[PDB]
Amino acid sequence: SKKILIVESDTALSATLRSALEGRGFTVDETTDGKGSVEQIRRDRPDLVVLAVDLSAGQNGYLICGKLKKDDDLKNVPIVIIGNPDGFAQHRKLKAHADEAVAKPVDADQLVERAGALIGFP
């Protein structure tokens, strides 16, 4: 099994991305709750996280990414950020950063290809 968690408060986008990944054979869960996502990942470990920058409630995805990538037990989980590419180069400068980053508006097919490249197609 290849398990993905989508952390995204845009529920329409999340459903489309979930469906594309599911069609390709991934198991996918979704959460809009950025605050709860790190502990959700700890207790229900996915193979990959798709993480939006623009989260509701003043959260941002690069911060959630940093929390994951600073945790020695969770840092090995690959993360694909989805958001405005104007932030991607700066994020590459951090010690703790996402494995990859894909622009919004998201090309769903390309996101699926990156998932497969990162964790294997199931």
Residue numbers in the entry: 2 to 123
The publication says:
The Myxococcus xanthus FrzS protein transits from pole-to-pole within the cell, accumulating at the pole that defines the direction of movement in social (S) motility. The N-terminal receiver domain (RD), a 258-residue coiled-coil domain, and the extreme C-terminal tail of the protein are all required for the dynamic subcellular localization and S-motility activity of FrzS.
We tested the functional importance of Tyr102 by mutating this residue to an alanine in FrzS-GFP and examining the social motility phenotype of the resulting strain. M. xanthus expressing FrzS-GFP Tyr102Ala failed to undergo normal colony expansion in the S-motility assay. Western blotting analysis showed equal levels of FrzS-GFP Tyr102Ala and wild-type FrzS-GFP in vivo, indicating that the phenotype of the Frz Tyr102Ala variant was not the result of decreased levels of the mutant protein. Similarly, no large rearrangements were seen in response to the loss of side-chain volume in the Tyr102Ala mutant. The overall Cα RMSD for the Tyr102Ala and wild-type RD structures was 0.23 Å. In response to this mutation, His92 switched to a more common rotamer that does not present Nδ1 to residue 102 for hydrogen bonding. The close similarity of the Tyr102Ala and wild-type RD structures coupled with the loss of S-motility of the mutant suggests that the Tyr102 side chain plays a direct role in FrzS function.
